[PDB]
Design a protein around this ligand. Sequence first.
Ligand code: 471
Lengths: 19, 269
Amino acid sequence: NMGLEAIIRKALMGKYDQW
Amino acid sequence: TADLKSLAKRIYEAYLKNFNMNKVKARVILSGKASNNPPFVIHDMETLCMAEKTLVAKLVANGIQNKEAEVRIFHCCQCTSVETVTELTEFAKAIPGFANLDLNDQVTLLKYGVYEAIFAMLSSVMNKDGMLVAYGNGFITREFLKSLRKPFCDIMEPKFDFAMKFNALELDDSDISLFVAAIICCGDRPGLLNVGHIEKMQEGIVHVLRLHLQSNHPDDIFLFPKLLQKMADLRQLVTEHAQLVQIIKKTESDAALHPLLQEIYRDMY
Ligand SMILES: CCC(=O)NC[C@H](Cc1ccc(OCCc2nc(-c3ccccc3)oc2C)cc1)N/C(C)=C\C(=O)c1ccc(C(F)(F)F)cc1
């Protein structure tokens, strides 16, 4: 790996939807 | 044995709702029919130019149409690795209890687990002659990649190989989903605060993994230990990938993760 937590930390907050 | 039972289901839906391309759709495009306009084959430099050209849709007036190609292919995969990383993040925060872990910790579980997960599924879309690219629309031949000027020709060959044997195991999405959850939820990642909740949590996934794998492929009794081994062939495949890829940060350094990944990166999600 390496650090791309940038992109991953933003997909962490910014959604809405769930069954 | 109640909430740990619908646990496997809840993880199969997380998968059947967060991955634009799974093994069944994937398997029908490849082996399939019921569509007479199959993937567009990228078998050489000319077709790879059409492909990559329409793809960035800023390259039929601009100029990105003939630089070393070995490095053009190293671009698409990124305009294909933000899509990929986000679905694995949604699918993960759809994994029972995963949403609990302190955010800071939820970044650690997906940071080291992201790559293993990709290559695992990457196997669904591959076959001994080439993999599928761009949501099943194109199909890059295996040969064409192992022909690119070194050290490129050896990036995709290790993965194709691992995938030919991994596909031999004959899993399906219900299996792959648990498998992929078990690689994210592994308490041996560096810097984990609550390094115990992740294990407790993980015991369930691997526990359902074993049970599902017994009543799904009842004749590969050793299939589970087999998959526990792959969870290993993959942590080491990524490791070697990481290496091979760094002769491209130092050397090539033209197309890196320059601060240009942002033009679309922010205001999007
Ligand atoms: C940035 C840090 C890093 O290295 N992360 C690992 C990141 C992980 C990854 C790998 C593969 C993948 O499937 C991508 C499937 C795919 N889609 C297309 C495509 C081609 C033309 C038009 C449209 C699509 O082609 C392919 C192989 C998706 C994600 N790899 C990145 C960013 C690049 C690479 O691993 C790579 C691969 C091959 C080459 C080579 F062709 F030169 F050999 C170079 C770099």
